[PDB]
């Protein structure tokens, strides 16, 4: 069994994003935590990091997400970065993935 | 069982020329070294007829040395089916891979007078120690039976080492 709905859906949505040219607001979410990474392709380089497992916070992971959401803005917007795309990878734009995006407010956005 | 050759060294000189001068181009190689040489065609032929990638050639060669080499490929030009380049493989202390003749021994093998000898492979690929090198291999069983088959693990297999893949293959049958 080569490649999986996971790996597939992952490329599918992520490949489209990488065409538009913008900086990528990649979102990896785990069972316990949710992390966020602003990457620049063609330079193969990350610019602004913002995890929850790095901000040692907890209590309802939909609300944690938004926090690490707003956390990403602050750190980033202070580096000039304003406009970006927003990955979303394998995750449907919903719950804590949608939450973090809604948190990414106070920083460029359009999402 | 022991065959002497001779040899020389190559660097320049077009193989075309050597060829013209009765000499037969060729390379000498193994895990450690690789160098181009040339034998004498008239000489080499005499040896290889009997040698034949089955037995070991010692290869004299200035340098006074005497190198344990099997012949692992003979390129002969199709137009005259004569050889045009030999490449000699030199042995060291590490199990090699080779072809060993198959002394079809026994008899008409069961149901005698008669049956079918069914000759498949006058050789066989074996991973063996460069030290002990079987001159051939006894292939008897008894024999034998009618419509049977000596696979491969049924064969003698002297204290060389073992087979070379192909656990199950013809080698014997009567029909």
């Amino acid at each position: 069994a080569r490649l999986t709905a996971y790996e597939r859906r992952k490329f599918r949505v992520r490949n489209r994003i990488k065409r538009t040219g913008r900086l990528r607001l990649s979102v990896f979410r785990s069972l316990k935590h949710i992390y966020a990474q602003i990457i620049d392709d063609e330079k193969g380089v990350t610019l602004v990091s913002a995890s929850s497992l790095a901000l040692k916070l907890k209590g309802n992971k939909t609300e944690v997400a938004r926090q690490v959401g707003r956390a990403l803005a602050e750190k980033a917007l202070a580096l000039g970065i304003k406009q970006v795309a927003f990955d979303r990878g394998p995750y449907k734009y919903h719950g804590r993935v949608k939450a973090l995006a809604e948190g990414a407010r106070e920083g460029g956005l359009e999402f | 069982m022991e065959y002497r050759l001779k040899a020389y060294y190559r660097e320049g000189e077009k193989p075309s020329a050597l060829r013209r001068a009765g000499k037969l181009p060729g390379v000498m190689y193994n895990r450690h070294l690789n160098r181009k040489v040339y034998v004498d065609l008239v000489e080499f032929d005499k040896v290889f007829r009997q040698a034949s990638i089955h037995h070991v050639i010692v290869l004299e060669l200035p340098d006074g040395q005497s190198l344990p080499t099997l012949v692992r490929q003979v390129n002969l030009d199709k137009r005259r089916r004569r050889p045009e380049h030999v490449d000699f493989f030199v042995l060291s202390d590490e199990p090699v891979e080779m072809y060993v003749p198959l002394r079809f021994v026994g008899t008409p093998a069961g149901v005698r007078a008669g049956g079918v000898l069914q000759e498949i492979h006058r050789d066989i690929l074996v991973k063996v120690s460069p030290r002990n090198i079987p001159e051939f291999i006894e292939v008897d069983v008894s024999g034998l039976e009618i419509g049977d088959s000596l696979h491969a693990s049924d064969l003698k297999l002297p204290p060389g080492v073992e087979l070379a893949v192909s656990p199950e293959e013809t080698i014997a049958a009567v029909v």
């Binding site: - | 290889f48 034949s52 003979v74 089916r81 050889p83 050789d123």
Partner: protein
């Protein structure tokens, strides 16, 4: 005589014969063989006449091999006609044979016998030939 059943395309160009025997080429089934010295198209009806000549001079045992096969469609107009309007028409099949190739090749017979058969068999061919035995060199595999 001897044609290849089911063909993707009937009627094929003709190409040249500058080759030198793709291979081949080194005997691989019998004790003796007939090798092609010249390039030619060998006709199924030429092969069948070479085969028979041997099985015949072998009492009936015997053990040919042939090794060449007529897969090339040979065409030819209906004569008494002029160029243009379709192509040949197919009147048989040939095997392409450049020098080096081993045709036929026999086994399970004496030498003064196999060699006499191969000679006969050779007279049925439009090219010059050569009889071989098979030594180490042949064991090219």
């Amino acid at each position: 005589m001897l044609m290849p059943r089911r063909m993707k395309y009937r009627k094929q160009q003709r190409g040249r014969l500058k080759g030198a025997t793709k291979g081949g080429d080194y005997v691989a089934f019998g004790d003796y063989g007939l090798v092609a010295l010249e390039p030619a198209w060998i006709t199924a009806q030429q092969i069948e006449a070479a085969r028979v000549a041997m099985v015949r001079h072998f009492r009936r045992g015997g053990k040919i091999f042939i090794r060449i096969f007529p897969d090339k469609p040979y065409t030819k107009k209906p004569l008494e006609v002029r160029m243009g309007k379709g192509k040949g028409n197919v009147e048989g099949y040939v095997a392409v044979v450049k020098p080096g190739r081993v045709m036929f090749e026999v086994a399970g017979v004496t030498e003064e016998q196999a060699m006499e058969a191969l000679r006969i068999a050779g007279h049925k061919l439009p090219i010059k030939t050569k009889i071989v035995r098979r030594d180490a060199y042949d064991e090219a595999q």
